[PDB]
Amino acid sequence: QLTEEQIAEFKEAFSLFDKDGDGTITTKELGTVMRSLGQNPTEAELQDMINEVDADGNGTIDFPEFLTMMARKMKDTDSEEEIREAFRVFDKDGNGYISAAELRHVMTNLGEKLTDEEVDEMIREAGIDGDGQVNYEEFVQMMTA
Amino acid sequence: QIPAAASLIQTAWRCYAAENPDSSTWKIYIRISQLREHHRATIKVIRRMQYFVAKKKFQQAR
Ligand SMILES: [Ca+2]
Ligand SMILES: [Ca+2]
């Protein structure tokens, strides 16, 4: 379940980040790619990203570790349960629904802070009911399908 | 815990929405004037890395 087309793309993507050519991705190089996309990542964020990919612990990302990151499952039963368990945080009475107004507040004003247009699209896909509630199992399913 | 929960949800949704070439999640990169292929490449990678970071912190907090 990995083709020579898939590997060529992942290898070309690996080199957009490895500006050095030394076969290894540094926090500095990752910060340079992010900063050119107009993001302003802190060093703390860059080190967390590198540390979640760096499997052997030498502070850099080689190509095999890059491959593991790109091929790691995101739509599996275990990830499904983590996202579901993340929504239950905001389901105060455990009834499977979050208030659309509470959802948009959390999505725009906590964590990474999505934009209002991003939340519009997000909430339009699950639908709001007559009661202003959002069935959040709809996100868990449509994101892991 | 609430910040870790919100970041897991938001980084998962940014990965999912980035699969749609016409999603409004692409409109936030105002530093790029014309989104090209290598741009959609690196963005998708970054968002993926930010999801695994948030998954890790959510596990610690729950
Ligand atoms: Ca390098
Ligand atoms: Ca390494």
UniProtKB/Swiss-Prot annotation, chain A:
The modification Phosphothreonine is found at residues 42, 108. Changing residue 87 to L: In LQT14; significantly decreased of KCNN2 calcium-activated potassium channel activity; not changed KCNN2 expression; not changed KCNN2 location at membrane; decreased thermal stability in presence of calcium ions; decreased interaction with RYR2. The modification N6-methyllysine is found at residue 113. It is found in: Cytoplasm, Cytoskeleton, Spindle; Cytoplasm, Cytoskeleton, Spindle pole; Cytoplasm, Cytoskeleton, Microtubule organizing center, Centrosome; Cell projection, Cilium, Flagellum. The keyword Phosphoprotein applies. One of its GO terms (molecular function) is protein phosphatase activator activity. The modification N6-acetyllysine is found at residues 19, 92. (Microbial infection) Inactivated by S.flexneri OspC1 and OspC3 proteins, which specifically bind the apo-form of calmodulin, thereby preventing calcium-binding and activity. Ca(2+) 2 binds at residues 54, 56, 58, 60, 65. The modification Phosphoserine is found at residues 79, 99. Keywords: Acetylation, Calcium, Cell projection, Cilium, Cytoplasm, Cytoskeleton, Disease variant, Flagellum, Host-virus interaction, Isopeptide bond, Long QT syndrome, Metal-binding, Methylation, Phosphoprotein, Repeat, Ubl conjugation. There is a cross-link at residue 19 (Glycyl lysine isopeptide (Lys-Gly) (interchain with G-Cter in SUMO2)). Ubiquitination results in a strongly decreased activity. Phosphorylation results in a decreased activity. There is a cross-link at residue 19 (Glycyl lysine isopeptide (Lys-Gly) (interchain with G-Cter in ubiquitin)). Ca(2+) 4 binds at residues 127, 129, 131, 133, 138. It is linked to Ventricular tachycardia, catecholaminergic polymorphic, 4: An arrhythmogenic disorder characterized by stress-induced, bidirectional ventricular tachycardia that may degenerate into cardiac arrest and cause sudden death. Patients present with recurrent syncope, seizures, or sudden death after physical activity or emotional stress. CPVT4 inheritance is autosomal dominant. Long QT syndrome 14: A form of long QT syndrome, a heart disorder characterized by a prolonged QT interval on the ECG and polymorphic ventricular arrhythmias. They cause syncope and sudden death in response to exercise or emotional stress, and can present with a sentinel event of sudden cardiac death in infancy. This protein has four functional calcium-binding sites. This is Calmodulin-1. The gene is CALM1.
